[PDB]
Each structure stands twice: as C-alpha cells, then as structure tokens.
Amino acid sequence: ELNNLRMTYERLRELSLNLGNRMVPPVGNFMPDSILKKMAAILPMNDSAFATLGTVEDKYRRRFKYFKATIADLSKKRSSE
C-alpha cells in the first residue's frame, strides 16, 4: 500500500507551496488541486504527454516547467516503488 502516487500528490503539494512562496509576488495557488491529482497519476514527463491531463490552462502549462524536476523523478520512481 506504498502508493507512490500519494507520495507524488504530496510532493506536489509541498513543492507548490515551496516554489509558490519563492515567487515574487507569491502565487498562492502554484498548481490547482485538480491538476496536482491528474499530473500525479499520469506523471507526464513531456509536453506531448501533458495532453493526457485532459485540460491544463496555457497559464498552467507555463509554470509547469517548475514541476518538471519533480514529475520526472516520480514518473521514473513509479516503476521502482
């Protein structure tokens, strides 16, 4: 029951608040709860794959670049844990 997806969703929550407060001015909502969920389950490591997220705003696609380092890691660890 070591749901890596849960670790992903949580890592995203921690990262969203981390980078979000590191932005000036603060974002507040670095990544919406919905996007954090689908991205944590699908774990898209590419823009061409991001299309499977269903609906991500273009503005969401931008700051997405700040999550690539974590998404890539969890997408890789998905087949490990």
Swiss-Prot record:
Residues 2-81 form the HRDC domain. It is found in: Nucleus, Nucleolus. Induction: Expression is regulated through the cell cycle with an accumulation in S phase. Belongs to the helicase family. RecQ subfamily. ATP-dependent 3'-5' DNA helicase able to unwind duplex DNA or DNA:RNA heteroduplex. Unwinds G-quadruplex DNA; unwinding occurs in the 3'-5' direction, requires a 3' single-stranded end of at least 7 nucleotides. Helicase activity is higher on G-quadruplex substrates than on duplex DNA substrates. Assayed with a catalytic fragment (residues 400-1268). Telomeres and rDNA are notably G-rich; formation of G-quadruplex DNA would block DNA replication and transcription. Heterodimer with TOP3. Forms a complex with TOP3 and RMI1. Forms a ternary complex with a MLH1-MLH3 heterodimer (MutLbeta) during meiosis. Interacts with TOP2. This is ATP-dependent helicase SGS1. It comes from Saccharomyces cerevisiae (strain ATCC 204508 / S288c) (Baker's yeast). The gene is SGS1. The chain holds residues 1271 to 1351 of 1447 of the full protein.
